[PDB]
Amino acid sequence: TRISREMMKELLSVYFIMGSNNTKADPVTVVQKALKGGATLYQFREKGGDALTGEARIKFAEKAQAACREAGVPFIVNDDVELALNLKADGIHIGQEDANAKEVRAAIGDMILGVSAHTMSEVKQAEEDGADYVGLGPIYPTVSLIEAVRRQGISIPIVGIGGITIDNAAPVIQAGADGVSMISAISQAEDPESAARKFREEIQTYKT
Description:
This protein is α/β, with parallel strands linked by helices. 45% of the residues lie in helices and 16% in strands. Keywords: Magnesium, Metal-binding, Thiamine biosynthesis, Transferase.
């Protein structure tokens, strides 16, 4: 069956997102360090400018997934449905533009489904479409909507994203989010493992 709302919320705590173009260091290493530091979920997001393509992209994907497995953390794929199914990913994340959430939900069985939402109505449609969690943002220039969502009684697991750092994360959890997702705060950090750990501890505190 679909993931439980309870387990989904726990997984979103420290949601690390990364592609090879998000770090000048070794990508596979930054991922291993983030997992070792305490990231609770990882999203493979290989896109934008100068991202890996073809076989090179697939190898990074398989290595990133292997690291998630050994660390016991779910592996989530951004956008690519075929890849998610081929690699047997733990789930997929999609945006509003190039994807029909309802059709994706039907194609992935009980895999975790994430959807980027930007409006109150998009949050509601994502849940209705079958999403297990919604990614809301950008929160910062890289929480009022989050507060508004919870105020109405919408209980879908929510993860904040967009310019989140160890110093502005707390307000996102207090607003009602179930976790924070980040890219550079960890991928570009001088000590990725340590950055992940701080986040891990910070979010624990505010959820507790």
